[PDB]
């Protein structure tokens, strides 16, 4: 039934001092049966990162679609799409299938190349934008992630501190959801360099 609960998976994103982080689990399941422990949910188009939770076919299709659109964008504009702009593209793209939507919960994260301003946003499946300063959550353990993030998070964390806070939020939330976990990855994102880290987490 519920297309949002067939495959399982989570994404979270957090802002810090001149940096953002976006993390996701690696589980791809078919109900109770775990199928893949390698299914990544965080893609990038230039310096703008997109996480996508929900029905896995749609996760795959939207990544292919935003790769297509951001590519033609770069050819015409002769520059890389910025986070703020990419958000609107995701929003308008989702609203365009209002009466047959993609069963997803997308999450944008990146730094504006001109202003240096860390930016995050999330969206419902028909593209309602949620643009909080603090943090964005999505997937089968959203409730859990909401309570971890609201309790753990403080403003202006340095990248290395932020990494601990987003990792502990994701991990401790996934271990209370049957359809999330099986590994996780965290992206720490700064103006210049970006560090990707695979976490050690319970394999049940």
């Amino acid at each position: 039934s519920d297309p949002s609960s067939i495959n399982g998976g989570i994404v979270v994103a957090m802002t810090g001092k001149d940096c953002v982080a976006i993390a996701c689990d690696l589980r791809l399941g078919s109900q109770s049966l775990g199928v893949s422990n390698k299914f990544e949910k965080i893609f990038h188009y230039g310096h703008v990162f997109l996480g996508i939770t929900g029905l896995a076919t749609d996760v795959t299709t939207l990544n292919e679609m935003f790769r297509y659109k951001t590519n033609l964008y770069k050819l015409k504009e002769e520059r890389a799409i910025e986070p703020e702009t990419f958000t609107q593209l995701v929003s308008s793209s989702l609203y365009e299938r209002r009466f047959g939507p993609y069963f997803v919960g997308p999450v944008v994260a990146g730094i504006n190349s001109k202003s240096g301003k860390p930016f995050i946003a999330g969206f419902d499946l028909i593209g309602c934008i949620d643009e909080a300063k603090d943090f964005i959550v999505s997937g089968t353990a959203s409730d859990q992630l909401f309570g971890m993030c609201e309790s753990l998070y403080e403003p202006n964390l340095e990248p290395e501190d932020l990494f601990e806070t987003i990792s502990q939020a994701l991990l401790n939330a996934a271990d209370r959801d049957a359809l999330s976990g099986w590994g996780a990855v965290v992206y720490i994102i700064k103006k210049d360099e970006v560090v990707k880290r695979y976490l050690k987490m319970r394999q049940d």
Partner: protein
């Protein structure tokens, strides 16, 4: 009715030629010269800007060299506006191939599709052809460096070095003279400029009347790079080859 005013753009001459194609080729022969040269370690694109002023902004200007992909570029000779229509549908075919197969489009495949579109305007629909000739410079992992050419007739062919637009007869003789198969990109750049320098309908060949692109595989990476040369960089490479 309307029959009175119909040119009939898709008919055969008594000789078996396509009027509108032939006349479009005539159109392209008056356009700025564009040159492709393929080396062992890369491809050069050079083209001459037909008509310029002191006041034409050369920085924000692109009329002859367009990026279709990250691995494929074209040099244009003919109507700029007609070219932009085809370049834009070529950019889409490349993305539809990447979305479908999760691999970058092979160069011949893209070139065939664009040639197929032109061929259509030659056999059905009652509309004029596109007054456009392309040099396609591209890399893929099947044939490596590839240099193609397409024209209003919808016909395409591959080349070691080729010219389109103005003074092709003169240009083709001078390339056929000084091209060798073992050539290097830096040699090719030098050959490309010498050729333009002698087919130009203008006094001297200055930086402000030139566009330049190279598709190399920078030895410190292992991947393919596209360089669309900036004004100052054409001005540099112009002094080095001894044209000041």
């Amino acid at each position: 009715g309307s029959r009175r005013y119909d040119s009939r753009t898709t008919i055969f001459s008594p000789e078996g030629r396509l009027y509108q194609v032939e006349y479009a080729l005539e159109s392209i022969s008056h356009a700025g010269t564009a040159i492709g040269i393929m080396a062992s370690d890369g491809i050069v694109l050079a083209a001459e800007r037909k008509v310029t002023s002191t006041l034409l902004e050369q920085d924000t200007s692109t009329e002859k060299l367009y990026k279709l992909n990250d691995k494929i570029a074209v040099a244009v000779a003919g109507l700029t506006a007609d070219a932009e229509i085809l370049i834009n549908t070529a950019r889409i075919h490349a993305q539809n191939y990447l979305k479908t197969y999760n691999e970058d489009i092979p160069v011949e495949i893209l070139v065939r599709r664009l040639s197929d579109i032109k061929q259509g305007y030659t056999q059905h629909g009652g509309l004029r052809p596109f007054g456009v000739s392309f040099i396609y410079a591209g890399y893929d992992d099947r044939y490596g460096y590839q240099l193609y050419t397409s024209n209003p007739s919808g016909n395409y062919t591959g080349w070691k070095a080729i010219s389109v637009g103005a003074n092709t007869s003169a240009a083709q003789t001078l390339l056929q003279m000084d091209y060798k198969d073992d050539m290097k990109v830096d040699d090719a750049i030098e050959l490309a400029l010498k050729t333009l320098s002698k087919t130009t309908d203008s006094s001297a060949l200055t930086y402000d009347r030139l566009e330049f692109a190279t598709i190399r595989k920078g030895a410190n990476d292992g991947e393919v790079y596209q360089k669309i040369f900036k004004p100052q960089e054409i001005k540099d490479i112009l002094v080095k080859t001894g044209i000041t």
